[PDB]
Curated annotation (Swiss-Prot), chains A, B:
This is Inositol-tetrakisphosphate 1-kinase 1. Changing residue 224 to A: Strongly reduced InsP6 kinase activity. Keywords: ATP-binding, Kinase, Magnesium, Metal-binding, Nucleotide-binding, Transferase. Its EC number is 2.7.1.134, 2.7.1.159, 2.7.4.21.
Length: 269, 269
């Protein structure tokens, strides 16, 4: 009796293997939603009508197909738009966006200061590096997340630092008490994981406002953010990283969370 | 007998006053080129045919008119495209682009390392700031050049630093021997000014290759860059700033340089 919605999905085979699971496909179809793979080997405008597109692909060809799609079909949502995803690719611009949140709660929300190093010479000669407290978080300045060496790494000593490839961004990583909070966000829904960095949770209303703010600022429905407590004061939180469309299939109950999401998106008013 | 070219110009009144001078307009017309102001109070597609557009305006309305213009008239050059100008607005992304030049000359070309500070708290608490050698160069992280307080400033002491507005980018400014080189570029043409920062020139072939590289990397025909010698080694140069469409009317002979440019652009093959 009631009509059916197509969710097209354009994902790499490994993301497909991990995120598109029998349980997801079956729950979604049970509620009237058909997850349908997108032929990477064929144009998007040549592909069957969609009420919703989700993807995690990069590259000029894909972005092009999506811009075309967006022009041709303004009412069909894209999760997430390529321009919104680009906002994550420069670490310094990403954190620029997070700076623009209003904080106007009894918990405070800061961004950590960063050192940017652009060449081999600087990595050896820059005096300021010799007054940095290890361990350090290092990330290439522009990445995307695709290459394995576009990921955050710890550095325990100067010698480890000198073997990294510039341009990179460094952050002191010492005020956190050995605890990271990975926060997974799916539209208006938030979930939170204490993890022990170096291989006592924040107030839930606070985390919700932060997730709310990042979502409005980045224009992404699917991300996680890492945060730490500043254990100097013990009421101050710092966002240290944001990653697009993370590995939700590790969270139990993810199929229910993503199916409710998919359904919210295909009733977008 | 030979045909005439229209150069449309969209500039703020103060840039108009300084750059559009009787000598320019008269030299250009003498060579068959009509500089014609653009009605800011009317749409661009409603304005008379142009063989060339030069502008120094910012804002979503202008960028829109230009994107439209670019779609409708691909063969008409725009100096410079808005997306190319945006490449200058984040100091860290700007220097990212300059990092990507090949250097493959007996002179070396580096980028200085930068500290990025995002909030008031960090400006007071960040330990790394207390091991920085003054004087410092400070610039807001995103600017555009429009507001007067979107310009590079010197900082002589910690107390001066604590009164600046984050997010900002800091650079140690101590290795330069008190000498800045402002380098003005107009398409393939370069010119060079020794200036005494804190209120013995580089090889010309070196400066030309750098200007060449920045021009190809940024996709801007009209900029200047500031460079210093590293006076430790005395053969190593660092780009410390780039500014779109600078005050050429201060250089004597600028009318001849810009008229030859305008003419090169309206024979673009
Ligand atoms: Cl997954
Ligand atoms: Cl001028």
């Amino acid at each position: 009796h009631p009509p059916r919605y197509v969710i097209g999905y354009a994902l790499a085979p490994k993301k497909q293997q991990s995120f598109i699971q029998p349980s997801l496909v079956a729950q979604a179809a049970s509620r009237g939603m058909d997850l349908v793979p997108v032929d990477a080997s064929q144009p998007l405008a040549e592909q069957g009508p969609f009420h919703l597109l989700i993807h995690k692909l990069y590259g000029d060809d894909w972005r092009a197909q999506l811009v075309a799609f967006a022009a041709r079909h303004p009412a069909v949502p894209i999760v997430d738009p390529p321009h919104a995803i680009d906002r994550l690719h420069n670490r310094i611009s990403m954190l620029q966006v997070v700076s623009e949140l209003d904080h106007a709660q009894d918990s405070t929300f800061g961004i950590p200061s960063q050192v940017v190093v652009y060449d081999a010479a600087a990595l050896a000669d820059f005096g300021l590096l010799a007054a940095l407290r290890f361990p350090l978080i290092a990330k290439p300045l522009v990445a995307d997340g695709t290459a394995k060496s576009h990921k955050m790494s710890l550095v325990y000593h100067r010698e480890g630092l000198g073997k990294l490839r510039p341009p990179l961004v460094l952050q002191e990583f010492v005020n956190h008490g050995g605890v990271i909070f990975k926060v997974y966000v799916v539209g208006g829904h938030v979930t939170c994981v204490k993890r022990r960095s170096l291989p006592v949770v924040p107030p839930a209303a606070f985390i919700n406002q932060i997730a709310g703010g990042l979502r409005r600022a980045l224009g992404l429905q699917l991300f996680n953010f890492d945060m730490i407590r500043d254990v100097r004061a013990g009421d101050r939180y710092l966002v240290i990283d944001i990653n697009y469309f993370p590995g939700y299939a590790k969270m139990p109950g993810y199929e229910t969370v993503l199916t409710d999401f998919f359904w919210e998106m295909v009733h977008k008013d």
